[PDB]
Amino acid sequence: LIASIGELLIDLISVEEGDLKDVRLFEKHPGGAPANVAVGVSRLGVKSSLISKVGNDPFGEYLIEELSKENVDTRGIVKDEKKHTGIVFVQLKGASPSFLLYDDVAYFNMTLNDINWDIVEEAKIVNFGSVILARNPSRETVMKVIKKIKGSSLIAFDVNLRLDLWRGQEEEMIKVLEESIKLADIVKASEEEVLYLENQGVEVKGSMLTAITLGPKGCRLIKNETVVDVPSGAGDAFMAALLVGILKLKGLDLLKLGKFANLVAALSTAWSTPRKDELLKYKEAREVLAE
Amino acid sequence: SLIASIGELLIDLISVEEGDLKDVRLFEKHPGGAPANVAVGVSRLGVKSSLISKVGNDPFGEYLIEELSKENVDTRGIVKDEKKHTGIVFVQLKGASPSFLLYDDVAYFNMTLNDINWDIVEEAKIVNFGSVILARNPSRETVMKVIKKIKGSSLIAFDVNLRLDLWRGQEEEMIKVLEESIKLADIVKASEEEVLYLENQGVEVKGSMLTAITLGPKGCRLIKNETVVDVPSYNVNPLDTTGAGDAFMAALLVGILKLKGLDLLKLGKFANLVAALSTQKRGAWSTPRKDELLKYKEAREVLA
């Protein structure tokens, strides 16, 4: 079982191109990296859990319904009576994609009282990302959960850096990213993030494995000093693939992992992860999923 | 001659299809918030209109200010909040049970006394507010102070615009603030359902100068002291009645501003015509323009 903990939210995706100021039409989709990964993990045929918080509102109900349809365990999703479901307005189109994320929302309001401990304890891998850490009490709550399960579950961290979420608190940002990276067995980061954080004296590496995304150029898997370069919603598909691969591959065969993750990422091209039997025709997937 | 509106200014994300908000896939972005809608109506009727509100320092805040500006609504009294995002509400207008999901920790609910352009409020001959703004502090206390400050110097108009969902857990505070607001108002607008609800809790729903009671599609009623003027609706074929209430408010306020006295018949016929004509226009800003209204004698009384 893989648990994901963090943001679960409505993506209001701009139908047309343009600055958010000018966008007239939005399409509602479930979103939030950990949710996307959790769905991806489930579509790859692994039992997946999501720990998050939604509002007691139609949007919270929607997100829970959408996750349930994907066979993601939703028992760890709590309803906030005081905060509304996370929303972000997304412009994915253009040279400069943008977002307007509403921060005073349910997923940023997680306390330790909100944590389903059965789920965290059942998890072989716990996945979290930096977005959830942007605000307290969820930052504190998540960090305490990760610290706790450290050594009992593999910890996966997607740097998923959104500087906008850290304005006026960039000192704290670096501290929490560093602490989170240090806690992580598996780190996913873009090379932009790697550069940015290392230029800040933060080494971007998992204790077990590091996945560096390279955009068009594909990605890189690093395990100690073994480096596998694999030329090429997809990022979260890729993460789901990595975590599923890590869980499935007895001795962490990096070549197989790489090939599997690339395939899932390729076929994905926010819930874009291919289903298990979309991958049965591929030797690369059977290598991971069936053996 | 200025009419100032104060309160919520937000993005309406309007369901483009029928269904529960849970299930609605597509939302059209429009400017909303009753006082903004009234402010636009006032401007459309040819009267200087200012809106005091607060948006986020974000694209949605910029959008709202720009849309207001396009309508010639003075936007100088709109403050940008560096800590809260622009108001948003997801709205299902269609079906038997229209619904909304209003996000409350947003900029328009974060007004403090420092955010108030006192020059604008002191200039206003009429100041318009509604109950939605009162649902949260600091804006509630701030707005109540603005209204108390100008009581006696400008006419105060209050759209009861009651949204019970905005007051859960604070129903006693709501009744208190609604009563205090009504008691401060010269002009009160309320639906017959609001009148019943509030008056049955010992809150008289009456402005000191004038009360406009809306009866939905059936029309409305204007009350001054003991005088009741019933204004049945015109037998319109409506395109969209979403903006009719705010169009009606705008007409009432412009009418009161323009007429010699509180002539209920002239005011009723004008507000009726504006509302009727608003039904032919889509969306929350449906008030017809002065130039269109001038083609009718009921409007020429007030506007010309």
UniProtKB/Swiss-Prot annotation, chain B:
Keywords: ATP-binding, Kinase, Nucleotide-binding, Transferase. GO terms for molecular function: ATP binding; fructokinase activity. It comes from the Archaea. PROSITE patterns: PFKB_KINASES_1, PFKB_KINASES_2. ATP binds at residues 189, 214, 219. GO terms for biological process: fructose metabolic process. Pfam families: PfkB. SUPFAM superfamilies: Ribokinase-like (SSF53613). Its EC number is 2.7.1.-. The keyword Transcription regulation does not apply. The keyword Secreted does not apply. CDD domains: bac_FRK. It is an enzyme of class 2 (transferase). InterPro entries: Carboh/pur_kinase_PfkB_CS (IPR002173), PfkB_Carbo_kinase (IPR050306), PfkB_dom (IPR011611), Ribo/fructo_kinase (IPR002139), Ribokinase-like (IPR029056). Belongs to the carbohydrate kinase PfkB family. This is Putative sugar kinase PH1459. It comes from Pyrococcus horikoshii (strain ATCC 700860 / DSM 12428 / JCM 9974 / NBRC 100139 / OT-3). The lineage of its organism: Archaea, Methanobacteriati, Methanobacteriota, Thermococci, Thermococcales.
